[PDB]
Amino acid sequence: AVQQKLAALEKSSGGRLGVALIDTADNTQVLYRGDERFPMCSTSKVMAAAAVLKQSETQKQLLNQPVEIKPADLVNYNPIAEKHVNGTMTLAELSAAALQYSDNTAMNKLIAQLGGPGGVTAFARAIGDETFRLDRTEPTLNTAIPGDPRDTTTPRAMAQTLRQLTLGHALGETQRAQLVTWLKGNTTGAASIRAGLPTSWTVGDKTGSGDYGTTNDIAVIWPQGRAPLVLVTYFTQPQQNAESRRDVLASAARIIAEGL
Numbered sequence: 690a691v692q693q694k695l696a697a698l699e700k701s702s703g704g705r706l707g708v709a710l711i712d713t714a715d716n717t718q719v720l721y722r723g724d725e726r727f728p729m730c731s732t733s734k735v736m737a738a739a740a741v742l743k744q745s746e747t748q749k750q751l752l753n754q755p756v757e758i759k760p761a762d763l764v765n766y767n768p769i770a771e772k773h774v775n776g777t778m779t780l781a782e783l784s785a786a787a788l789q790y791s792d793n794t795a796m797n798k799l800i801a802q803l804g805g806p807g808g809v810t811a812f813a814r815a816i817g818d819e820t821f822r823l824d825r826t827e828p829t830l831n832t833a834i835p836g837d838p839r840d841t842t843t844p845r846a847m848a849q850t851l852r853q854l855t856l857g858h859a860l861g862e863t864q865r866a867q868l869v870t871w872l873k874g875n876t877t878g879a880a881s882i883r884a885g886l887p888t889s890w891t892v893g894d895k896t897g898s899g900d901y902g903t904t905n906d907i908a909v910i911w912p913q914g915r916a917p918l919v920l921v922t923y924f925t926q927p928q929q930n931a932e933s934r935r936d937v938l939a940s941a942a943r944i945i946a947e948g949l
C-alpha cells in the first residue's frame with residue numbers, strides 16, 4: 690500500500706519521486722524508484738562534509754584550518770560566506786555553513802579541499818558507495834537535467850551511505866558525532882521530511898533544491914521510543930523552471946511514517 694500511496698503522490702505531483710527508507714531496528718527497506726538516478730543538488734553537501742571529516746581523522750588540526758574567502762569565490766547563494774569575504778573561515782565553519790545553511794561557497798570550499806568533485810566521489814567509493822558521483826561544483830551541479838548522470842545518485846545508495854556516515858562506521862566516532870550534530874542543526878528542513886513526521890521525533894536532515902523544480906531531502910530520524918531511520922526523498926519535475934515542491938517531500942515522509 691505504501692508503494693501505491695507513493696505512486697499516487699508522484700502522479701498527483703506531475704513529477705518523478707524517489708524514496709528510500711531504511712528502518713535500522715530490523716534493517717527493513719522501503720523503496721520507490723530506489724535504483725533510479727536523481728540529481729543530488731545540495732544533498733551532496735553531506736558527502737563533501739563527511740569527506741572533510743574523514744580527512745580530519747588523519748589530519749588533526751584540519752577542521753580548524755582557515756580558508757580564504759575572496760570576493761570572486763562567492764556564487765549564487767552565500768548566506769554565511771558573504772559575511773567573511775576578504776577574511777577566512779575554518780573548515781569546521783565552512784562545513785557547518787554548507788550543511789546547516791546550504792551555503793554554496795562553503796560547499797565549493799569543501800570540494801576544493803578534497804581536490805575537486807572527484808575527491809568527493811573518491812570518498813564515496815572508499816566507504817563502499819559505488820553509485821554516487823559528483824562531477825561539478827556549485828552552482829552547475831544543480832542543473833538537474835533529465836537523464837544527465839552528472840551529480841546524481843539513487844535513493845537506495847544514498848540511504849545506505851547516510852547510514853554508514855551517521856549510524857554506521859564509515860567515519861570515526863567523533864567525526865560521526867560531529868556530522869550528526871551538524872545535520873541536527875539544519876535550518877532549512879522544517880517544510881520537508883520534518884513537516885510530514887510526528888513533531889516529537891528528532892531529525893537531522895539536509896535539503897536540496899535545483900532546476901527542473903528539483904526538491905530533495907535526506908534525513909536520519911530518531912523517533913520517540915524507537916530505533917533510528919534513514920529517509921531520502923528526491924523529487925524532480927519535467928520543466929526547467931518548475932517551482933519547488935517541498936510539500937511533496939513532506940507528503941512522502943507522511944506516507945512512509947504511517948507505515949512505521
